[PDB]
């Protein structure tokens, strides 16, 4: 719900998703 949530949420999921998807 809240910008907390979808903000951690997004955070460490984007940057996950960022950093396997460039060195993939």
Same mark, same amino acid.
Not at 13 to 22: D, F, P, Q, R, T
């Given at each position: 719900? &809240? +910008? !907390? &949530? *979808? *903000?951690?949420? $997004?955070?460490? %999921?984007? !940057?996950? *998703? &960022?950093? +396997? +998807? %460039?060195? $993939?």
């Amino acid at each position: 719900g &809240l +910008n !907390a &949530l *979808k *903000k951690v949420f $997004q955070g460490i %999921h984007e !940057a996950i *998703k &960022l950093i +396997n +998807n %460039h060195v $993939q």
